Amino acid sequence: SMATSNPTVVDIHTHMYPPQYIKILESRTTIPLVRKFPQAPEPRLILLEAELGDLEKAINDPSAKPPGRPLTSHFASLDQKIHFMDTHRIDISVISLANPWLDFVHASHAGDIAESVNDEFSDMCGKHHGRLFFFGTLPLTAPLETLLASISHLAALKYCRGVILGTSGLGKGLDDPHLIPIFEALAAANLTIFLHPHYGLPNDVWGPRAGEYGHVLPLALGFPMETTIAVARMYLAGVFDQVRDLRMVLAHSGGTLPFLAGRIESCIFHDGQLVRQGKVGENRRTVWDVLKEQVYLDAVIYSEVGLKAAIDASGSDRLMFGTDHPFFPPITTDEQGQWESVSLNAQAVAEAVGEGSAEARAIMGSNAIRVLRLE
Amino acid sequence: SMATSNPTVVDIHTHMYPPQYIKILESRTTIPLVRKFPQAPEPRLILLEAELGDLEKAINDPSAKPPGRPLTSHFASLDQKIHFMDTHRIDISVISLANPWLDFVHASHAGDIAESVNDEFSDMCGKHHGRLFFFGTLPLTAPLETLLASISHLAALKYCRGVILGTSGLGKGLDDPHLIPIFEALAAANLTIFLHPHYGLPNDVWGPRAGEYGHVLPLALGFPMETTIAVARMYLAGVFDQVRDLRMVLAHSGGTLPFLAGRIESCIFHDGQLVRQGKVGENRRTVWDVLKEQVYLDAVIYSEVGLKAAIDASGSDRLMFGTDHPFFPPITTDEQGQWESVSLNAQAVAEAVGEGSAEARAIMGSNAIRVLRLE
Lengths: 375, 375
Ligand SMILES: [Zn+2]
Ligand SMILES: [Zn+2]
Known about the structure:
Chains A, B: This is Amidohydrolase. The structure is a homodimer. By secondary structure, the first copy, chain A, is of the alpha/beta class.
């Protein structure tokens, strides 16, 4: 019995909220916040602009449908994380703080809250040696020297393997030139970036009836689209050519990137301004080059259709399995049993590359172990 | 066999602006418009909200760049269309008014204008019998009775095989209940809808550096995303279930729809509100179902990666070749020659299904012929 018969399964897309972070979320009035209501036995976690028109309604009425999503024991409990892993035959998790990280924290307290949280994550991973690693979080509201010291901390921090971060960066996007030395620091520290959505799109794009459709529009369309816009702006700004040893893992198989790379390239090629400014040269690095050299994709796509396009774009050696625990728990079955949300992704892997093939082993664990040095 | 040795090639995504429509645009002072500028030989076509900052500058400073895009002969000339078709071995084009159609017209003249434009297309198609069919355009600002009159007219109109419409419908989107009687009327008349983007996303999402990126962001990401959002809204509101006879072709392979169908499905399944409201369950017609029964997809995706995803989601019998002429002319080479934007899609079909295979023949023309009754 050997490694191939009994492979190491790894989930690289799995979130927590440590107790301190909830303490902050509870003591808040604007997004993000956690607030207990009488009807639902669990505190309601409210994170999105779309959840707002339901919060302003459930504050002036105790009969109204509860806002946001349930804050369960799955967000905070580590034993809960381990239990989920054991039920789903996951061997190793790479845990990360969930959206919106520290992006709202005031510039002054940010650094210290960052240090505290990342220390906590490292302690958690310490509780189960071998099975836990983490993407740390950055205080991007803090000024440059705090940021750099934070990165230095992470690079020294046990069990750490990268950082997770959203698409606003320093408040101007990811193509913001002031971001560069931070990328450079990350790159030099060998800290892999897990880029992840949160802000989605302007709430108005969803139309008037949007509340009839639950969280579907913002979570299924808004998140992946946000990720695609972020990375495409990163790319058009030249961040990848400029910071060559930068390594990013995109949430939700790059959002819609694999599907649109063709279109992006064709649009570049055919852009009057871009060609006449000498930007469409023949030695240019394409979206495809970045997709094969600098960017990795998670396999959180829920179907072999998307998974197959993701694999086409990046290669099966650049895909990594995830679950997005615990944001999509079972409603009508036991939260302690099998999660449909996991089994869809496993099924997509199986249908895309075959059960037990070498590509399946790579996507289910090996790629992650190699790329994120999980020793 | 002779039919196989010499297949009919059909282009279903191709645009013109009739002389009369151009006139209407020429006397306008707000989007959309056409006016001449000293600095460029051809008048400028201004459609996008992204082109407004350049326009404001061009009026005030004669050394600034000419805003918008060249309104070339490719837009208004029929002979130029036939030339494009011959250069690229295209046997039949199903032509259509380009965005923004009649979305800007007053309710009281919309019907008269519509009738005039649709009649003109019919006349053009009549000029090269056998090689030209069109999607008509609808007076979507006019009152319901006028709409139905238009639909009745199109149903009878020589060379008409459907209608093209944008993603805003009557202003409030495609999940607007007032669209139902229009959808039903189109369905009953066998007018296939060609759903096409225009409004993209709020120009704010491209960020502060957007001007450095030419038209890439609004065209490469904005358009296909607008399409995805429109169809997703239409699907979640039950439109497809309510009008079972409805047939829609989606522009740009459904935007990003095939890559996201899985995600949408998992999100519906896991939505607290939708489950509580009893909308989840196993007799629900899925996105997948809709993609195989009601919705067709054009092949304007520029890459085999995406095209394979589209075929996976809809089947090779539901994909149709298109060029998007004349929106992406070569910049570097002669515009009377070969267009890279045709070459790229041709190559996508070739690499996705194999040259000369039955699937290639179907996508490149047989599908259109069967679905749009071009014989
Ligand atoms: Zn997540
Ligand atoms: Zn078009």
